[PDB]
Amino acid sequence: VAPTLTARLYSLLFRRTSTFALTIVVGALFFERAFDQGADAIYEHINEGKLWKHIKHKYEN
Amino acid sequence: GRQFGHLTRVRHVITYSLSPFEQRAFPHYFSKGIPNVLRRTRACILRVAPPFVAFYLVYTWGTQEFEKSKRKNPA
Amino acid sequence: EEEELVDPLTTVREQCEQLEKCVKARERLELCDERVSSRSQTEEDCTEELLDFLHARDHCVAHKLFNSLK
Amino acid sequence: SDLELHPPSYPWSHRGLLSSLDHTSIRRGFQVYKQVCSSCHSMDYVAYRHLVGVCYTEDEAKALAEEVEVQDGPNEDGEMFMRPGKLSDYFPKPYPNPEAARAANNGALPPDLSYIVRARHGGEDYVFSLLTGYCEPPTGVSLREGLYFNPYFPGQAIGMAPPIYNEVLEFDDGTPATMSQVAKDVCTFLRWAAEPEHDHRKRMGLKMLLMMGLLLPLVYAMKRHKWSVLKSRKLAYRPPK
Amino acid sequence: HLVGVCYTEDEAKALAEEVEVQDGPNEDGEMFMRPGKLSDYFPKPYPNPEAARAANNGALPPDLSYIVRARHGGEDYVFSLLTGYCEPPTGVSLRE
Amino acid sequence: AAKNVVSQFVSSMSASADVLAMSKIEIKLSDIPEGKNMAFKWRGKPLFV
Amino acid sequence: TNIRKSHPLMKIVNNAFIDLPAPSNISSWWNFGSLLGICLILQILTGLFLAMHYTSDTTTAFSSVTHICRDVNYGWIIRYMHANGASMFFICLYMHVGRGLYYGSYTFLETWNIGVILLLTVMATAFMGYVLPWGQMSFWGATVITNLLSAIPYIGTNLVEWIWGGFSVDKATLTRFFAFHFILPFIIMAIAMVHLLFLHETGSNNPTGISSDVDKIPFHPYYTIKDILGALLLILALMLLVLFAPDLLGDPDNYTPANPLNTPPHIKPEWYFLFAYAILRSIPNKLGGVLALAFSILILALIPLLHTSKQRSMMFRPLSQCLFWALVADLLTLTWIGGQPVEHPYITIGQLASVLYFLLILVLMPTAGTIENKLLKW
Ligand code: HEM
Ligand code: HEM
Ligand code: HEM
Ligand SMILES: COC1=C(OC)C(=O)C(C/C=C(/C)CCC=C(C)C)=C(C)C1=O
Ligand SMILES: COC1=C(OC)C(=O)C(C/C=C(\C)CCC=C(C)C)=C(C)C1=O
């Protein structure tokens, strides 16, 4: 579940340049989302000055 | 121009190489690595460092003289 | 104005203005202040000693100020 | 006159590399701009719609624009009438020709606010130290009774009167309008009008650092892997005899 | 522009002096009147295009500076227009 | 990263001080007699009534 | 046969980035050539997008620049990438020239001389760039600079007025500067290709200054990826600048709209000309100042004639290394002085540093080479 691990990745997906590409493109899609939200939340925590205040003013529309 | 096979004449030199997939990208990286940078530093400080401190000094003095000059006691 | 609003500036400035570095600078202020008063045809005008005092005070101002400000 | 003093380092809430603005503080600072500053200060580059994403909401921003009159385009007669105020307009108001500022305040112009923080040397600090740090003229230096005193000013002969303790305000929820407090907010807002992109940039900058911290080692390892062949290559010289 | 063409320095100055322009602001932020240089142009009639309409009625006497080159037929279109005014034939009433 | 820089440069060619769309013009009907097509300027576009 | 090797178009690529025999030992310092390549394209790309909203009229010049940063989607990064990229272009330019000097690379006369033309061209390019926003520093910078040309005897007044398009830096002058700032980078590129054309007759030099025909490697795995890793490092530097400190190298005054009556007490160039600026004002003369200003740049064309050492690089020459580092240190002094008023200390130190610059390149460095030869019994 470790030597055979990168071995499977190579066997099932990296051998052909076909899959290799398909995997990084499928891998670019998910990663974008995970990095975006994941980094927004880090930018979110170190702050709390912007639109956390929204709950007040709005709603009264 | 240039090309390979038309560069120059070389004789009696063997070159053993190993595939990148069989060796490590960072062998003794910190082990052999850091000693080398210190050694490269020793080799060059006396040639790089001095000119710069001469400026560092001329800079701090130069600033002090200027700022201290726009002040005055008698007359 | 006359009496009613507590300026944090004024509050923290007191404690600040006091302190060592500023005591000394204000000393020269007053020293030089009283020289210029004591004459007529002079021009050594005390502009400098004021700024030095202010610097020392103001550095300490910034460091201790904003903490309380809401 | 040819002698000067430099501002301290105030701990603004947007001083850090990855530090947002206090958007509640930009509000009150806009309020400070609206009444006090506005009568003399032109903020030609900011508009009402600019505030929407920042502090207020659609509705609130509309309303604030509606509390002024603009001078809208011509109709059939070749006119020039007045309109409530959109969201589309900007904040150009004080007075037309630059000479009118002079005629009023006296041969001096309250320099436009929209770009101040970024145009001084020292940012909000210069302005904060100016506004808050007003003082009294020492020995032998008389002025011209329109030339007030400020240590944080080139030459120290300034044409602006100290307008920070005139306690106005609508700190909605409840914030005391001391000289200090109105000054932080007015500068916090000014930072924003000079650099509206401020926050978003630091969010990208955060991401730039995280991406680089992931990319840098990886590209390095890619390159070392390919350079391997050369780094461990061994040579031998074997001449005849 | 007229100097090299028809008139002389002096004459051209004078013709500009027979109007008033609305020169730049001074100390108070003003907008006063000036005799007329040589430097100014001929923009005068009225400001907004809508004023032409308000006057002549929903119509603008199109700017003259580029007319000859903007019609189709040059001076001929304009000459034939100006000179060749006539009377409305049968059944076609106008709007006074 | 490539997406983001490319997307940003692509986006730079859309909005601006072009969010306008206010208009909502109120038109007086008695100004247009029978058989006439009166054109107005609405949201930067010609509006026929 | 292959496809890369034979196709008319691909040949060029192959012969320049794939099979090109490169020395196996070139280090970072050799990366600045590709980095200048990237900076050139980066300047062109962000430069084009800015031109899609920028107005070349004094009435709206500043406003259009402001319009870009607030209203245009992502207009601000594009604007700062442009501004900061111009600085990145000068840091790389300076590394590149210095690398050439230390290493003896200038012995490739045509390549190097073309390089001098490339330096002048991006300099002329960046100067015109800075005037475009029509800030106080743009206008007074434009003023102080152009007016230098009025020191040229008998022709100077007419020359300055000819490029001005009037008696001052006005309407005619801004639009003018836009056009030239648009066309110059394309010409630069054609010249960068001729630069690379001459470079190809010999291939690259290397740290030892000794010929490397004996150990060349393909540019094809080794230098493609090393240039890649290096461009990533250029991006870091640029982005660090633009997403955290976009005005750090900028002057807060170019933020106040041009005012032909208001002369700022300041008045200094963008940092990349500060050393030349310092050399210029060190001279109590109108003609001499500009004669020596010019000579502080055109001297790079005299360098190959002043090579005196029997070795090419400085790797094996200690005395020469010290003199080189004193040149770089002297250039810090020059920029520092150039960014300071012409009052106390500053006048005499900036005056002596100017003499040193020319004493170093013109007399000291050559003399060292002769001495070094002698120590080696050569
Ligand atoms: C709290 C709101 C205000 C702020 C933040 C503000 C800020 C500033 C700043 C930053 C400057 C330029 C500093 C410099 O040149 O280095 C300035 C100049 C000036 N302002 Fe204000 N101001 C405000 C309200 C006013 C008001 C109400 C007036 C009308 C009395 C006024 C009249 C002036 C004048 C005349 C100057 C020009 C001074 C000179 O250069 O001679 N300002 N202001
Ligand atoms: C648009 C500006 C320039 C561009 C695009 C440019 C591009 C390049 C490139 C791609 C290389 C090959 C790789 C390298 O060594 O870096 C190179 C090498 C060289 N360049 Fe430039 N460069 C420019 C400005 C200069 C300047 C300012 C000089 C000096 C006057 C210069 C003189 C040289 C020389 C002598 C070499 C050979 C260096 C060696 O092989 O050791 N070029 N340049
Ligand atoms: C043909 C490609 C280029 C185009 C189309 C271009 C266009 C522009 C435009 C429209 C401006 C005014 C907008 C602004 O100030 O941000 C500008 C400013 C400037 N550009 Fe370029 N430029 C190009 C290449 C260059 C090059 C090669 C340089 C030299 C490194 C350069 C350095 C500058 C500088 C220093 C400024 C003024 C500083 C600032 O950003 O405010 N640009 N350019
Ligand atoms: C007003 O501020 C200034 C600049 O910013 C606008 C400059 O750029 C320069 C120097 C500029 C150049 C092009 C010198 C090179 C001349 C030749 C003949 C190669 C100076 C001195 C300066 O004072
Ligand atoms: C063997 O030495 C060389 C390198 O290794 C230091 C390079 O990295 C490059 C890189 C040059 C590029 C990518 C072209 C850019 C030019 C333009 C006009 C865009 C060249 C030419 C070279 O000869």
| DSSP 3-state of D13 | coil
- Which residues in G63-89 are b (16+ Cβ under 10 Å) and which e? ebbbbbbbbbebbbbbbbbbbbbbbbb
> Are residues G229 and D223, on separate chains, in Cβ contact within 8 Å?
yes
d(CA G185, CA G36): 12
- Give G77's contacts in chain D (Cβ within 8 Å): 197, 201, 204
User: Which residues share a beta bridge with G257?
Assistant: G135
Beta bridge partners of F42: F45
* Contact criterion met (CB below 8 Å) for G319 and G368: yes
- A11 DSSP 8-state letter: I
Question: In whole angstroms, how large is the CA radius of gyration of chain F?
Answer: 19
CB D198 within 8 A of CB D118: no
What is the DSSP annotation of C38-49?
T-SS-----HHH
d(CA A23, CA A20): 5
Among D29, D65, D56, D36, which residue's Cα sits nearest to residue D191? Answer: D29
Sign for the pseudo-dihedral over CA of G99, G102, G106, G112: positive
3-state SS, one letter per residue, for G82-95: HHHHHHHHHHHHHH
| CA nearest neighbour of G261 among G143, G128, G122 | G143
Query: Is G193's C-beta closer than 6 angstroms to any atom of ligand 5?
Result: yes
Q: Is G200 a catalytic residue?
A: yes
Q: Which of D40, D106, D160, D189 to mutate to test the pocket of ligand 1 (most atoms within 8 A of CB)?
A: D160
State CA G4 to chain mean position distance: 35
- Element of type H or E holding G56: none
For G337-366, the DSSP string reads HHTS-SSTTHHHHHHHHHHHHHHIIIIIHH
- For ligand 3, say whether the CB of G26 is within 6 Å of any of its atoms: no
Resolution in A: 2.6
Elucidation method? X-ray
Which are the contacts of D32, defined by CB distance < 8 A and separation ≥ 6?
Answer: D182, D185, D186, D189
What is d(CA G152, CA B55) in angstroms, rounded to the nearest whole number? Answer: 34
How close F1 comes to chain D (CA, Å)?
Answer: 8
What is the Rg, in whole angstroms, of the alpha carbon atoms belonging to chain A? 21
Assigned token pair, E23: 């020169």
Alpha-carbon distance of G283 to G276, in angstroms, equals 12
Q: Which atom of ligand 3 is nearest to the CA of G122?
A: 29
Residue D94, SS3 per DSSP: coil
Distance CA G74, CA C2 (A): 51
Chain G residues with CB inside 8 Å of B6's CB?
A: none
Separation of alpha carbons D5 and D153, rounded Å: 8
Distance from G112 to chain F by nearest Cα, in Å? 34
- Is G110 considered catalytic here? no
Facing residue for G256 by CB, picked from D17, D119, D212: D119
Q: Which two tokens stand for residue D55?
A: 């502090």
CB under 8 Å, gap of 24 or more: what pairs does D99-107 form?
Answer: D99/E25, D99/E26, D99/E27, D99/E28, D99/E29, D99/E30, D100/E25, D100/E28, D100/E29, D101/D40, D101/E29, D102/E27, D102/E29, D103/E27, D103/E28, D103/E29, D104/D40, D105/D40, D105/D159, D105/D160, D106/D146, D106/D159, D107/D159
Distance, in Å, from the CA atom of D108 to the CA atom of A54, rounded to the nearest integer, reads 41
Q: Report whether residue G368 contacts ligand 4, using a CB cutoff of 6 Å.
A: no
Measured distance between the N- and C-terminal CA atoms of chain G, rounded to whole angstroms: 49
Taking an 8 Å Cβ-Cβ cutoff, which residues of chain D contact chain A?
A: 13, 18-25, 56-60, 199, 202-203, 206-207, 210-211
Look at residues G274, G268, G252 and name the one whose alpha carbon lies nearest to residue G331: G274
Closest ligand, as measured to the CA of G103: 2
Q: Are G58 and G174 in contact (CB under 8 A)?
A: yes
Nearest Cβ partner for D5 among C1, C5, C55 = C55
D49 CB neighbours in chain F (<8 A) are: 19
Question: Is the CB of G192 within 6 Å of ligand 5?
Answer: yes
Separation of alpha carbons D195 and G244, rounded Å: 12
Residue of B nearest to G12 (CA): B1
Quickly tell me which residue has 């701990």 as its tokens: D11
- Whether D142 and C47 have beta carbons less than 8 Å apart is answered as no
**Does the beta carbon of G26 sit less than 6 angstroms from any atom of ligand 5?**
yes
Residues after which chain E has a gap (C–N > 2.5 Å): none
Nearest CA in chain G to B68: G344
Chain G residues in contact with D205 (beta carbon < 8 A): 239-240, 243-244
Q: Is the separation of the CB atoms in B51 and G325 below 8 Å?
A: yes
Active site residue G268: no
D49 and F19: CB-CB below 8 Å?
yes
Across the interface, do D223 and G228 touch by the CB < 8 Å criterion?
yes
Does D187 count as an annotated binding residue?
A: no
- Tell me which of G56, G87, G204, G309 is the catalytic residue: G204
DSSP at A10: I
Q: Judge: D88–F1 Cβ closer than 8 Å, yes or no.
A: no
Q: Locate the ligand 2 atom nearest the alpha carbon of residue G199 and give its number.
A: 37
Instruction: Please tell me if residue G75 touches chain F, with a CB cutoff of 8 Å.
Output: yes
F7 Cβ neighbours under 8 A, 6+ residues apart: none
In 3-state terms, what secondary structure has residue G4?
coil
CB atoms within 10 A of CB G35: 23
Instruction: Please give the CATH topology (third level) of the domain spanning G1-378.
Output: Cytochrome Bc1 Complex; Chain C (1.20.810)
What residues in D contact E29, CB-CB < 8 Å?
A: 95-103
Q: At G257, phi and psi to the nearest 5?
A: -45, 145
- Which spans in chain G are helix H? 8-13, 32-51, 61-70, 75-103, 109-131, 136-146, 156-164, 171-200, 219-244, 274-281, 286-298, 318-338, 346-359, 365-375
**Helix, strand, or coil here: B13?**
strand
Q: Is the CB of G118 under 6 A from ligand 2?
A: yes
Question: What is the DSSP pairing of strand D148-149 with strand D90-91?
Answer: unpaired
Question: Closest by alpha carbon to C48, among C62, C34, C28?
Answer: C28
Rounded Cα distance between D191 and D122, Å, is 12
The residue ranges of every structural domain in chain G are 1-378
Contact yes or no for D129/D101 (Cβ under 8 A): no
CA closest to G69 among chain F residues: F16
* Angstrom distance (rounded) from CA F17 to CA G71: 6
Mutate to test the interface with G, among D230, D231, D234 (most CBs of G within 10 A): D230
- CA separation for the pair B57, D41 (Å, rounded): 45
Tell me, yes or no, if G227 is annotated catalytic: yes
What chain A holds in terms of domains, given with CATH numbers, is: 1-61 (1.20.5.260)
Task: List domains and CATH numbers for chain D.
Answer: 1-196 (1.10.760.10), 197-241 (1.20.5.100)
Tokens of G314: 């400085």
Alpha-carbon distance of G280 to G266, in angstroms, equals 16
Amino acid at G330: D
- Cβ within 8 Å of residue C12, ≥6 positions away: C61, C64, C65, C68
Spatial distance between the Cα atoms of D149 and D155, rounded to a whole number of angstroms: 10
Measure G47 CA to ligand 3 centroid, in angstroms: 5
Ligand having the closest approach to the CA of G254: 3
User: Are the beta carbons of C46 and D139 closer than 8 angstroms?
Assistant: yes
Q: In sequence order, what are the residues at sequence separation of 6 or more whose Cβ sits closer than 8 angstroms to the Cβ of residue D169?
A: D28, D31, D177, D182
Which spans in chain A are helix H?
3-9, 17-45
| Residue of D49, D47, D50, D28 whose CA lies nearest to D37 | D28
The strand ranges marked E within C1-70 are none
How buried is G261 (Cβ within 10 angstroms: 0-12 exposed, 13-18 middle, 19+ buried)? exposed
Calpha distance G38→G43 (Å, rounded) = 8
Which residues span the domain enclosing C65? 1-70
Tokens of E26: 């001074």
- Pick from G322, G336, G340: CB nearest B51: G322
A45: which 2 tokens?
């925590």
CA distance G230 to chain F (A): 16
**Residues contacting C45, CB < 8 A, separation 6+:** C36, D138, D139, D140, D141
Question: Do the beta carbons of residue D228 and residue B27 sit within 8 Å?
Answer: no
Residues of G in contact with D121 (CB under 8 A): 252
Task: Give CA–CA dist G47/G184, Å, rounded.
Answer: 12
Helices G171-200 and G109-131 cross at an angle (nearest 10°) of 160
- G141 CB less than 6 Å from ligand 4? yes
Report the SS3 class of residue E64: coil
Determine whether the interchain pair G255/D230 forms a contact, defined as Cβ–Cβ distance below 8 Å.
Answer: no
Shortest CA distance from G73: residue in chain F: F12
> Which of E27, E30, E54 is closest, CB to CB, to D77?
E54
Is B4–G216 a contact, with Cβ atoms under 8 angstroms apart? yes
In three-state form (DSSP H/G/I as H, E/B as E, the rest C), the secondary structure along D36-86 is CHHHCCCEEEEECHHHHHHCCCHHHHHHHHHCCCCCCCCCCCCCCCCCCCC
Instruction: Judge: A58–D207 Cβ closer than 8 Å, yes or no.
Output: no
Place of tokens 């500036």: C9
What is the C-alpha to C-alpha distance for residues E54 and G340, in angstroms, rounded to an integer?
62
> Are D24 and A53 inside 8 Å of each other by CB?
yes
User: With contact defined as beta carbons under 8 Å apart, do G66 and G50 qualify?
Assistant: no
Q: How many angstroms separate the Cα of D66 from the Cα of each of C12, D32, D83, D86?
A: 41, 18, 8, 7
Question: Do residues G129 and G229 lie in contact, with contact meaning Cβ atoms separated by under 8 Å?
Answer: no
Ligand 4 atom with the smallest distance to the CA of G141 is 1
What are the CA-CA distances from residue D54 to residues D37, D49, D61, G63, G99 (Å)? 20, 9, 10, 22, 48
**Minimal C-alpha gap between B31 and chain G (Å):** 22
**Does the beta-carbon distance from D228 to B20 stay under 8 Å?**
yes
d(CA G164, CA D30): 43
Class of domain B1-75 (CATH, top level): mainly alpha
- Whole-angstrom CA distances from D16 to D198, D199, D201, D206 are 12, 11, 13, 12
Q: Is D75 on the interface with E (CB under 8 A)?
A: yes
For ligand 1, atom 12, which residue shows the shortest CA distance?
D111
CB A43 to CB D24 under 8 A? no
CB G171 within 8 A of CB G258: no
**Distances in whole angstroms, Cα of residue D146 to Cα of each of D5, D107, D157, G37:** 22, 10, 9, 57
In angstroms, the CA G326 to CA G310 distance is: 22
DSSP string, G151-186: GSTTTHHHHHHHHHTSSSS-HHHHHHHHHHHHHHHH
Instruction: Indicate if G212 belongs to the active site.
Output: no
Query: In terms of DSSP bridges, do strands D148-149 and D157-158 run parallel, antiparallel, or are they unpaired?
Result: antiparallel
